[PDB]
Amino acid sequence: HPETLVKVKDAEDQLGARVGYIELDLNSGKILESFRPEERFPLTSTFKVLLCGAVLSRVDAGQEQLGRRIHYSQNDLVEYSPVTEKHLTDGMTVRELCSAAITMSDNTAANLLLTTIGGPKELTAFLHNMGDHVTRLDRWEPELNEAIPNDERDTTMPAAMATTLRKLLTGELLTLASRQQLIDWMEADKVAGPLLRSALPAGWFIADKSGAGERGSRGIIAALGPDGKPSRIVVIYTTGSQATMDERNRQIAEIGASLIKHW
Ligand SMILES: [Cl-]
């Protein structure tokens, strides 16, 4: 709906910074609405979903096992590791790392998973290898969150991220089992409350991943829809703003309410 873009433009005005927006049909992949679809923004923690899509693709290919256990040490823990910091003794399985990376945005869990696939370069190669020549991961947690203005390291564009997410949730890229696990982890997201979830009416489905970093960077990727099933993908990114976190959350929640109102 073109009225949703009026709210997207208003978010830009309120944040004093760029906002990129894409709403996609889940079934056809068609772009329904877009704003700055081809401009780069920092991935921050939204890359965690792409990381576990690359992990799941290796599982599908018999090179990795969801039940494999990894052990690690205090020297591996970086900031914002609420789950991994609790399992130093027992270690965690690849499945439990993905869960922590997606549902809790656990940073050491992302680094551990990155090491399983050969680092940021290999994530970028996975994305390159599934048709996405835009999205790129260059660094590890936490430095990937730096959001230096005009730096293309650790960035995507709203349209590239939206079509990639759709290919991960729907294509024959991944087996049914893998596609269902990725979305089930997204649906279990615990750290994106004040964004699209705060505008979502009772009974609607949402599977999302949010991100926050430095210099006002903030974003969210989602599969959502009425009647307890996803029917659309939405991607929202912003960076640069000096507005506080509460105000960035509110602008994204208001984009979400406007999208719902105009569904
Ligand atoms: Cl490993």
Residue numbers in the entry: 26 to 238, 240 to 252, 254 to 290
What does the paper say about this structure?
The system of five interrelated, functional β-lactamases stems from the recombination of two homologs, the TEM-1 penicillinase and the PSE-4 carbenicillinase. We further expand this investigation to engineered enzyme variants by examining the same range of motions in a closely interrelated system composed of three recombined and functionally selected variants of TEM-1 and PSE-4, or ‘chimeras’. We thus demonstrate that a variety of non-native slow motions, including active-site motions that occur near the frequency of turnover, are compatible with β-lactamase activity in engineered variants.
Among 32 natural variants of TEM-1 characterized to date for substitutions at position 68 and 69, Met68 can be mutated to Ile and Met69 to Ile/Leu/Val; the substitutions Met68Leu and the Met69Thr in the engineered cTEM-2m and cTEM-19m do not have natural counterparts. The inclusion of 17 substitutions left cTEM-17m essentially unaltered relative to TEM-1, but inclusion of the substitutions Met68Leu/Met69Thr in cTEM-2m and cTEM-19m dropped kcat 1 to 3 orders of magnitude, to levels similar to PSE-4. Finally, the Y105 active-site wall of cTEM-2m had an RMSF of 0.14 ± 0.05 nm (0.8–0.11 nm for the others), indicating ns-µs motions unique to this chimera. Among the 26 dynamic residues in cTEM-2m, we find 7 of the 11 dynamic residues of TEM-1. They are located in the active site and in the α/β domain, the latter containing the majority of the new dynamic residues of cTEM-2m. Thus, the slow motions of TEM-1 were generally maintained while additional residues acquired ms conformational exchange. Dynamic residues in cTEM-2m border and extend throughout the active-site wall 234–244 (Ile231, Lys234, Gly238 and residues 241–246), while TEM-1 showed a single dynamic residue there (Arg241).
